[PDB]
Design a protein around this nucleic acid. Structure first.
Ligand SMILES: [K+]
Ligand SMILES: [K+]
Ligand SMILES: [K+]
Ligand SMILES: [K+]
Ligand SMILES: [K+]
Ligand SMILES: [K+]
Ligand SMILES: [K+]
Ligand SMILES: [K+]
Ligand SMILES: [Mg+2]
Ligand SMILES: [Mg+2]
Ligand SMILES: [Mg+2]
Ligand SMILES: [Mg+2]
Ligand SMILES: [Mg+2]
Ligand SMILES: [Mg+2]
Ligand SMILES: [Mg+2]
Ligand SMILES: [Mg+2]
Lengths: 100, 96, 125, 206, 84, 115, 150
RNA sequence: ACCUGGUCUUGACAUCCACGGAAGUUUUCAGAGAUGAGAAUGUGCCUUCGGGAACCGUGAGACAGGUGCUGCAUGGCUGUCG
RNA sequence: CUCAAAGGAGACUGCCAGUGAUAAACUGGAGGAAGGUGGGGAUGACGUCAAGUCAUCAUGGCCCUUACGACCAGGGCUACACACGUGCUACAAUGGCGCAUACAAAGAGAAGCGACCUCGCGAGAGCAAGCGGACCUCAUAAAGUGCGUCGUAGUCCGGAUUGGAGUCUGCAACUCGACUCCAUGAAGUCGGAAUCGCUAGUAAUCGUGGAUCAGAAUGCCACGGUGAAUACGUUCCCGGGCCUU
């Protein structure tokens, strides 16, 4: 993946961590039935103001070694190609070819 | 009563670690080691960089699980289990 | 004393206890008729006793788990056969000839990569 | 056709894992990433130290790294000065307390990774590919290897058409799982392009 | 559709613009990229130019348009028929 | 027999027969019958004229037949007059709910028209 | 196959009448592995048949089978620019297989409301040599008679 | 990774140097946003009270960057006969 | 006892008879859970196609460098006279629907799985246990079975399409999400030429789980339930191996 694309992910993770508490507050106000309609309305408007990259859904899991945006596996944090290479070298603990 | 849950990716390593624990505790009464169900986590990956969807590798990580029960633990026994150092690659959870 | 046999078929495992009795069969705290609606399942369960002609001479307490009705019926038959052989060794030869003694090793074949099922292939052009 | 990775197929049969730690899903990916960065640093740092294999263990909250090197002295340094420097860097990369163990590799000619690295070094020095391969095979068999195979692929001799050349002596039974096959690869970076080297060394069954 | 409890969605910048325009009087068409913003009753009688990806399309808000997103009235793809 | 300006089938069970009315499905049919106190299995022929009248009153509660058709027509007409995306899809006789048009879409497009 | 190593597969006898032949007939009627559904149709059909027949179910089925079974059949052999239908004697197991398959096929094509009714009607017609299953046996025999020369 | 329009040019992402600023934290206005113009609050860590390095900037210029081309220059990986 | 999972035992043409060149082997038989490769998988020789991948990555060379680099909003990748591939759902009664009621395997889970209870027709909502799990949760197996009904109809088949009304995730569902409710109720009555899969727990059919993943499977990967037909054979068609010409 391009250097910029990897950089974009780093920014998104940082912003998400920065505003996580604020976003959770606003969302809770909007969700609550007890909260006033005016309070809800203000919360909705405030959430829009926050940077878009602050939302976790904007983040795309990428292979940690290559930054590949497809074929990712969460357990290893690697794409299928890099997973295979590491597995064969015995770098991934407990992982072997399986038959049944 | 002290319950010890052992987890390892290698069955041989876990068996040695359990044997150490049971012996150390014996030097309080112990129940088992009990062989708990091994978890087999399977993964399937495409092995070509491009296309060839039917070309795959299937991998598995087996997590071995052992339960040892220390009943009426002596104060010395408790300390002996804490002092005992098991092999790396064996995860140890102690429950009281 | 109770004579015990273990029977397995497909994913079913059956525990059979046989004692001298009067043709009473209980499966998982239910009558044979209650537990098995299918006539074939009942037939399979009763096959060993009919062969040895001890249908009304014994009482069977059976517990079965796993698989389905046909698997459970087959597992019970295997377990009964084993129990009968424990009760009387001479019965084995007749039971063996019937094919009750053999444990049916047929299992569901795993799905394989690039195949729709175990053997079914995607349509080719 | 394509062949299974000889080390990978033998894992848990006659070949041990290079990383031997237990982690939950939460920490598994982080441990893999840390292992990668540790191995990356050490490989670059000890490029001239003839490192064959880096074994990473994670006992408790600490990382224990075992470096297998043909030349133990150069890695250790003077009064363990060099190894201590490595330990400090590894601890920073790992983010946990680091312990470094140095294991000597006797018979580097019988070590697939070392043989491959030697060949690639020679290719970069513009040594003739055939000579490098033949010497490697001869050396291993002299040292008592039951068999060896060496394959070199790419623009050999700077030829416009890339080709693959291989030499084998003794037994190299890749289909035999019990057979102890040391396999490793190296890449030579030349003016004409990358040349790939693969080495298989058989050390007997089991 | 957006849950009723959350209420109608409008981009804050568009809302501010609409309020200012209403207060000011009859105004030159408002230029917005907010296709996702719901049309509100206050917007009625205002012309909003909604981006279609390449150009801002003038939309004169009417009572019927209320409760619809602005992007609904600006078409993104151009098709004049095959073999036309 | 005759409800909502249409003739319902006498031979069918009431619950099925009522579905003949436009704007009445199985759910509404069951609700109407429950309110009328008439069993679903009972055939329309079996029902007395008084029972039929009770059914007629229940049907009158829901918009049905011509009134429903007028409402549906107006709703589609409004969209087409609006010139909203949906309206345009109605005008062109193409899918309105974001389905694929590269293939399929035969229900809206009709039988395949050779180039 | 070329190897010809095929061996017989045991068929459990039908529960009600203890007949392997009837169990085969259930398997032929069965669709999608639903043997219970298939058995219900056959048992219902046999009872209906037995009432009209005035015979035991197994006897009535056997009478139907006797009428539909083919003694001889034709196998195609290509000779140059032409193909010759060659008459071949049907072995006894195949005779049953063909008879049952034809009866089921005929029953499926009938217009009666349920399969059990269709099967009973087909089975009854076969006993009196009148159904499409018996017609298929007639056609097979005629084709074999015509090609007796080959 | 494409398009339309709005934007930046040692640069989103590195190393180096000089210089000024702890880093950061909370807010205002304009803007579609990028961003720009502001305000307020922190001002630590190390420290041979020479200092550093933490990280923000600003200014060069060596460079960075490219999912740009050639799989008919290649490695690696893969299909295929099987 | 079932089961869990470590360590062992067991199958060797070992035994027996016949055949065969005093052979290799073959055939049948016994015992045995298993018999001659017991079943399935992994495992892919030297090479072939300048086969695929410079967009995983790496890399020779070339090319751009206030732009072929970098940032942002909106749009597009979802277009639609049409052609093809792979699927899903059907065309019904071996079925549809209603009610009642049996029997699995495998797997996942902490920015997670989420019970119970209350509320809503429902999708869901609120409240709130337990569980980093043989413990708790996902989680209901379905086909089946009993009983009733429908009665061969474009139907009580089919469920496309469209209107209206909602839910949930998400800054945000217009382009362009899934799902729910009410209403609507298309084509389709078994498919030209042609063509595909499959030899047994297989095909067929029935549900179940997982990866990816905020949300978004009829795909993919995996799991059990039910469970066939047929193989005489090698003349033919096609492909492959070996010897010869
Ligand atoms: K209706
Ligand atoms: K290549
Ligand atoms: K290149
Ligand atoms: K579309
Ligand atoms: K599909
Ligand atoms: K959408
Ligand atoms: K999801
Ligand atoms: K030849
Ligand atoms: Mg995402
Ligand atoms: Mg299956
Ligand atoms: Mg496919
Ligand atoms: Mg090529
Ligand atoms: Mg090519
Ligand atoms: Mg964008
Ligand atoms: Mg696409
Ligand atoms: Mg040969």
């Amino acid at each position: 993946a391009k250097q910029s694309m990897k950089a974009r992910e780093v920014k998104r993770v940082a912003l998400a961590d920065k505003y996580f508490a604020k976003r959770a507050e606003l969302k809770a106000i909007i969700s609550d039935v007890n909260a006033s309609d005016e309070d809800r309305w203000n919360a909705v408007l405030k959430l829009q103001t926050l940077p878009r990259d602050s939302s976790p859904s904007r983040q795309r899991n990428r292979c940690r070694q290559t930054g590949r945006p497809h074929g990712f596996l969460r357990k290893f944090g690697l794409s299928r190609i890099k997973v295979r290479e590491a597995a064969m070298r015995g770098e991934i603990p407990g992982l072997k070819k399986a038959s049944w | 009563r002290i319950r010890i849950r052992l987890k390892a990716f290698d069955h041989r390593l876990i068996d040695q670690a359990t044997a150490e624990i049971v012996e150390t505790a014996k030097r309080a009464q112990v129940r088992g080691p009990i062989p708990l169900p091994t978890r087999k986590e399977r993964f399937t990956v495409l092995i070509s960089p491009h296309v060839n969807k039917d070309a795959r590798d299937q991998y598995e990580i087996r997590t071995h699980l052992r339960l040892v029960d220390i009943v009426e633990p002596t104060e010395k026994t408790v300390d002996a289990l804490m002092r005992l150092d098991l092999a790396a690659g064996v995860d140890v959870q102690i429950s009281l | 004393n109770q004579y015990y046999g273990t029977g397995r078929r497909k994913s079913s495992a059956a525990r059979v206890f046989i004692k001298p009795g009067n043709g009473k069969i209980v499966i998982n705290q239910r009558s044979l008729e209650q537990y098995f609606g299918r006539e074939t399942a009942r037939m399979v369960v009763r096959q060993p006793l009919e062969l040895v002609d001890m249908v009304e001479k014994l009482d069977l307490y059976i517990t079965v788990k796993g698989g389905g009705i046909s698997g459970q019926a087959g597992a019970i038959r295997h377990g009964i056969t084993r129990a009968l052989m424990e009760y009387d060794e001479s019965l084995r030869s007749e039971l063996r000839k019937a094919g009750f003694v053999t444990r049916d090793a047929r299992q569901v074949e795993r799905k394989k990569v690039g195949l729709r099922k175990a053997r079914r292939r995607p349509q080719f052009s | 056709g394509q062949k299974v990775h000889p080390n990978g197929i033998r894992l848990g049969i006659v070949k041990p894992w290079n990383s031997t730690w237990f982690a939950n899903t939460k920490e598994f990916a982080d441990n893999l990433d840390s292992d990668f960065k540790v191995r990356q640093y050490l490989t670059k740092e000890l490029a001239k130290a003839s490192v064959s294999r880096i074994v990473i263990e994670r006992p408790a909250k600490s990382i224990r790294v075992t470096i297998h090197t043909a030349r133990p002295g150069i890695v250790i340094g003077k009064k363990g000065e060099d190894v201590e420097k490595l330990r400090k860097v590894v601890a920073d990369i790992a983010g946990v307390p680091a312990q470094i163990n140095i294991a000597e590799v006797r018979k580097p000619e019988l070590d697939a990774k070392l043989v491959a690295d030697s060949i690639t070094s020679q290719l970069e020095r513009r040594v003739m590919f055939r000579r490098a391969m033949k010497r490697a095979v001869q050396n291993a068999m002299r040292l008592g290897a039951k068999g060896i195979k060496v394959e070199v692929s790419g623009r050999l001799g700077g030829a416009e058409i890339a080709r693959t050349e291989w030499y084998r002596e003794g037994r190299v039974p890749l289909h035999t799982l019990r057979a102890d096959i040391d396999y490793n690869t190296s890449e030579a970076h030349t003016t004409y392009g990358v040349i790939g080297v693969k080495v298989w060394i058989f050390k007997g069954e089991i | 559709p957006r849950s009723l409890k959350k209420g109608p969605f409008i981009d804050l910048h568009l809302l501010k613009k609409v309020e200012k325009a209403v207060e000011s009087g009859d105004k030159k068409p408002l230029r917005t990229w907010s296709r996702r913003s719901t049309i509100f009753p206050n917007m009625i009688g205002l012309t909003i130019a909604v981006h279609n990806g390449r150009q801002h399309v003038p939309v004169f808000v009417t009572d019927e348009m209320v409760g619809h997103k602005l992007g609904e009235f600006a078409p993104t793809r151009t098709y004049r028929g095959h073999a036309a | 027999a005759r409800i909502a300006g249409i003739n319902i089938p006498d031979h069918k069970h009431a619950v099925i027969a009522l579905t003949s009315i436009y704007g009445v499905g199985k759910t509404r049919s069951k609700a109407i019958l429950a309110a009328a106190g008439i069993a679903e299995d009972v055939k329309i022929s079996e029902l007395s004229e008084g029972q039929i009248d009770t059914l007629r009153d229940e049907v009158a509660k829901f918009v049905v037949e011509g009134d429903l058709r007028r409402e549906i027509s107006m709703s589609i007409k409004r969209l087409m007059d609006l010139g909203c995306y949906r309206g345009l899809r109605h005008r062109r006789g193409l899918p309105v709910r974001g389905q694929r048009t590269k293939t399929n879409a035969r229900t809206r497009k009709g039988p395949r028209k050779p180039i | 196959p070329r190897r010809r190593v095929i061996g017989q597969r045991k068929i459990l006898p039908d529960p009600k009448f203890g007949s392997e032949l009837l169990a085969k007939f259930v398997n032929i009627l069965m669709v999608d592995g639903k043997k219970s559904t298939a058995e219900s149709i056959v048992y219902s059909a046999l009872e209906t048949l037995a009432q009209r027949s005035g015979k035991s179910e197994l006897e009535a089925f056997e009478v139907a089978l006797e009428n539909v079974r083919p003694t001889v059949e034709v196998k195609s052999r290509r000779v140059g620019g032409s193909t010759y239908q060659v008459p071949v004697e049907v072995r006894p197991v195949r005779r049953n297989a063909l008879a049952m398959r034809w009866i089921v096929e005929a029953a499926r094509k009938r217009g009666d409301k349920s399969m059990a009714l269709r099967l009973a009607n087909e089975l009854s017609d076969a006993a009196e040599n009148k159904g499409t299953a018996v017609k298929k046996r007639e056609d097979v025999h005629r084709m074999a008679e015509a090609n007796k020369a080959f």
